Ligand SMILES: [Ca+2]
C-alpha cells in the first residue's frame with residue numbers, strides 16, 4: 001500500500017499528458033456513421049437548416065461523440081506521457097489484474113462543428129484503496145480528461161475504473 | 170415467375186444516378202486503410218502521393234464501391250434493380266447469400282472532396298443451379314460510377330442467392 | 335419549463351449483434367468484447383456486449399428524443415451496471431429530478447433481464 | 461526489366477474476428493454474415509466470413525506492397541472459391557503473367573488450409 005501510494009505520487013508529478021490531436025477533425029462521414037448506428041434521428045447532426053433553427057452556426061457534432069474523435073483506433077498505442085500506462089502496470093504487478101469501468105461523467109462546454117480539430121489531455125486524479133468490493137479487493141483510479149480545440153477547453157470527463165484481484169488470485 | 174421479374178426490372182432501365190452519402194473523404198480512407206492494413210503512403214500523405222505523380226492524397230481505387238454503399242441508414246431508391254430481386258429470392262426461401270465474382274475497372278484515381286454517383290443495371294439471373302451451399306440462382310449486375318458526367322469506374326459482379334441445405 | 339417528476343416516454347432497444355457491433359465500431363472502439371464472441375466468452379463474459387460510448391450516445395438520444403432538436407446537452411454522467419449482452423433488450427426510463435434556472439436534470443435508467451444496465455444523470459437546457 | 465514470371469513476396473493474413481468485422485464495416489458492408497456468427501450459421505455457413513469488398517482491397521494491397529506507391533491500378537478481377545472463415549489464415553501468392561509497354565498483369569491467389577479462397581487478375585502500370 002505504501003509503495004503504491006509512492007508510485008502514484010511520482011506518476012502524478014509528471015502532470016497531465018501533452019495534448020494529443022484527434023486522428024481526424026470533427027467530420028460529417030463519422031457523424032453519419034455514428035447517428036446511423038445509434039439510431040439518433042436528431043436533425044441538427046445532419047441538416048444545416050435544422051441546426052440553424054436550433055441556434056447553431058451549422059451542422060453540429062453530437063456532444064456524446066467527444067471521446068470518439070480521440071480514440072486510438074485499431075492497434076493504437078498510448079503516448080509515452082499517458083499516466084494510465086504506468087498506473088495499469090503498477091496495479092497489474094501488485095496482482096490487481098482485473099479491470100472494470102465504474103463511472104464516466106462528461107461535461108460539454110459547447111457543441112463542435114465539422115472541421116474543428118480536437119486534442120485530448122489526461123491527468124490522474126484520486127487513487128483510493130485497497131477496498132473490499134463485490135468483484136474482489138481492488139483500487140479505484142480516477143482520471144480527469146480535457147478536450148480542447150486549440151487552447152479552448154470544449155469538453156471534459158471524469159473517468160473512474162476499478163482494478164481488482166479476480167476470484168482466483 | 171423469376172424471369173418475368175428480371176425482364177420487368179431490365180425494362181425499367183439503369184437506375185437514376187444516386188449520389189454517394191459522402192464525398193470521397195479522408196476519415197473513411199483512414200478507416201479503410203487501417204482495417205485492410207494497407208500502408209501505401211499515397212492514401213494518407215500528400216507528399217508521398219505527389220512523389221507518385223498525384224496532385225495530393227488519392228483514394229484507394231478498391232474503395233469505389235464503399236462510397237455508395239447504403240450502410241445502416243441508407244434507404245434504397247425505388248428504381249434500385251437488385252433490391253426487388255433479392256426480396257423475391259428471400260421470400261421464396263433462398264435466404265442465403267454469397268458474392269462470388271467481382272471485376273472492377275478504374276479510369277482514374279479519385280481525390281478527397283470529389284462526389285461519386287452510382288448507376289446500376291440488372292444483368293442475367295441464372296439457375297436453378299446446384300451449388301455446395303445448396304440450390305441457388307446467380308445474379309449478375311453491371312455498375313457505373315461517375316464524378317459529374319465523367320465515368321470514373323465500372324464493375325461487373327455476381328452474387329449467389331441460395332436455399333441453405 | 336418542464337417540472338420535477340415529469341416522465342419521459344419509454345424507449346425499448348433490442349441488442350441484436352448488428353446493433354452491438356455497429357455501435358461499438360461507430361464509436362471507434364475496437365475492443366474485442368464488443369464484436370468477438372469468442373473473446374468475450376474467453377474473458378468470462380456471456381457474449382458480446384454494448385460498450386460505454388454507445389451507452390453515452392443512447393442516453394443522449396433518449397433525452398433529445400423527448401426534449402427536441404433545440405435541446406442543449408450540458409453533461410452526461412453514467413454509473414455502469416450489469417452488461418447488455420447480445421439478444422437482451424434494454425428499456426430506458428427517465429424522470430426530471432431538478433430544474434435550476436433553465437437547467438434541467440434528468441435521471442435515466444436502462445434496465446434489462448440482468449438488472450440495471452446503466453443509471454445516468456443528464457443536464458440540459460430546453 | 462519488368463519480368464514475366466516475377467514472383468511477389470508471400471503475404472499471410474490471419475482472419476481473426478476483429479479483422480473480418482473491422483474490414484467489413486470499413487467497407488460499409490453491414491450484411492449480418494460478416495459480423496454475426498448466428499446469422500452466418502443460419503445460412504449454412506460455418507462462421508462469419510470475409511466480404512468481397514475486403515477481398516478486392518486485399519488483392520490491391522498485396523500488389524501495391526510489391527509494386528510500390530507509384531503503381532497505378534487499372535483493374536481488379538476476382539473469383540471466390542472457398543470461404544475465408546474466422547480463424548483461417550489466407551496466404552497470398554502472386555506472379556507477373558504479362559508485361560506490355562508499361563502495363564503489367566499480375567495473377568494473385570489467396571489460399572487457406574482447405575483450398576483457394578480467391579483468384580484474381582490485376583492490371584496496373586508501374587514506374
Ligand atoms: Ca436477405
Ligand SMILES: [Cl-]
Pocket residue numbers: 363384385386387
Ligand atoms: Cl467500453
Ligand SMILES: [Cl-]
Pocket residue numbers: 267268489510511512513
Ligand atoms: Cl460480400
